[PDB]
Amino acid sequence: FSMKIGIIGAMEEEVTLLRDKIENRQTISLGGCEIYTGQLNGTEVALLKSGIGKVAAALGATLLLEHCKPDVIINTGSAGGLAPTLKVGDIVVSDEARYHDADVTAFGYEYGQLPGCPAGFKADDKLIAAAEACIAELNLNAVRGLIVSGDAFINGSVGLAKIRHNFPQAIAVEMEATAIAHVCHNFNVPFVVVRAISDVADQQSHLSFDEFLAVAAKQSSLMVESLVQKLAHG
Amino acid sequence: MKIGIIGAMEEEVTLLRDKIENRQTISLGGCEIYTGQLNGTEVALLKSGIGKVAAALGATLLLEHCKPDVIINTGSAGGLAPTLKVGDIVVSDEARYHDADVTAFGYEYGQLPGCPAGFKADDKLIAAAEACIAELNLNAVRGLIVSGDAFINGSVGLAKIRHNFPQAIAVEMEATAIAHVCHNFNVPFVVVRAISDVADQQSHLSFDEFLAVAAKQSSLMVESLVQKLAHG
Ligand SMILES: CSC[C@H]1CN(Cc2c[nH]c3c(N)ncnc23)C[C@@H]1O
Ligand SMILES: CSC[C@H]1CN(Cc2c[nH]c3c(N)ncnc23)C[C@@H]1O
Ligand SMILES: [Cl-]
Ligand SMILES: [Cl-]
Question: Catalytic residue at A20?
C-alpha cells in the first residue's frame, strides 16, 4: 500500500489502454513527454509516454525517475519477434537488455557495450518471476530472454542478419528497452520489459506492424495490468 | 547568465573543472555536475559518460537541476571534412543521428519520429565561436556534425556515414543526443569540439595519441567562448 509502479511506453497507441484504466488520473507535461499519475485498481502508478527511440526513451525515463521516484519500472509496448516459436500477440519478457547498435570494439569493449556500462543490463529477478506467474495464470504463449534495442526499425535484409549474427540468442528487437534499462541502472532502479509481438522484423515487418500493433498493445497492456496487481498483492 | 557545458569523458572536462572557482559538485544518476565561475562567468559543467543515452540522461539532469541559459558541447571528434587535422576545431551548424533509421515509415534517414530530421545550433552561439576562432588564429570548419553509438574506424561504418551524409564535417557519439534534449526544452546549443582522429582505419591509434591534444584545444575554445558570451 506504499509502492509506486512506473510504467513506460513509447507511442500513444502503446499506452492509451493503460492510461484509460487509471483512477484519479492527472497529467504532467514536461520535457516534451507526458506522465499520467493515479492508481491502477488501487495501486499508485506513474505512466510515461516517451516517444520513439533511445534518446527520447532516456530523456523520459530520467524525468520519470527524478519527478516521480517510482519503485520499479515496467516497459511495455510492441516488439519484433526473433525467437522461432513466437507469433504475433505473444509475450516477451526480458532477462536482460543490450544495444544491438553500439560498437566501441575498436577499444576492446564487447559488441553492444558502451564504455562505463556493463555489457548488458539485467532485469530484476522478482519482477521477472511475477511476470511469469501472470503468463501462467493467463495461459499466454511467452518467451523469456535477451531483448536488443537500436535506433532503427528492423525490416529484414542485413539489418536483421546483423542482429541474428551478433546476438544469436536474442528473442526480440525494439527501440527503447535498453535505453530505459541503462537509465534505471544508473539510478539503481529495478526494471523489467514485458512487450508483445507485432511483427517478426522481416521484409513485411512494416505491414505486419500496421495490422497488428493493436493486438500487441492489447496483449502487452493486459500483462502489465496483471503484473501491477501481482506486485501489489499476490 | 548561466552557461552549461557538457563533456562525455573525464579527460574532456578535467581542464575546465580545474578552472572553476566557487566550485561545488553534484552527484546524480551516475553523472557529475560542477557549478561555479569560469573566469568570472557562472557555469554548470557536466561529465556525462559516453554515447547517446548517457548524454541524454546527463543533459536532462543538467537542465532540470541547473537551468542553464544555453548549452555548449565540448570534447574530441573524428574529422570528416578534407581540411581538418588533429587539433583543429569543428563547430556545429547542425546535428543529426547517423545511425537512426525509421525510413520504412517514411521518415528521413537519421530522423526519429517526433523530431526534426536535424537539430540546428544557435546562430549567436555560432557567431561568438567563430569570433574566438578568428581572435585565436585557429583553423576550424563549420557545418554538420553526425552522432551515433559507434566509434568510427574506416571500412563499412565510415562508408555508410559518407553515403548518408556526404557533407558531414565530423562524427562523434553525444552531440545529437544533447541537441535533441535541448530541443525538447527549447534551450539553445552549439557544439565546439576538436579533432582527435579522422575516423579512418587507424582512428583508434590516433585517438589514443591525440585525445589530450583535442581535449585541450576544445577546452581552450570553450573558455574563450564563455568569456565572449558574457563580457562581449
Ligand atoms: C514507428 S517505429 C516503431 C515503434 C515500435 N517499437 C517496437 C517495434 C516493433 N517492431 C519493431 C521492429 N521490427 N524493429 C524495431 N522496433 C520495433 C519501436 C518503435 O517505438
Ligand atoms: C572511447 S569511444 C570515444 C569518445 C570520443 N568522442 C569522440 C570521437 C572521436 N573520434 C571518434 C570516432 N572516430 N568515432 C566516433 N566518435 C569519435 C565520442 C566517444 O565519447
Ligand atoms: Cl545472444
Ligand atoms: Cl550531408
Answer: no
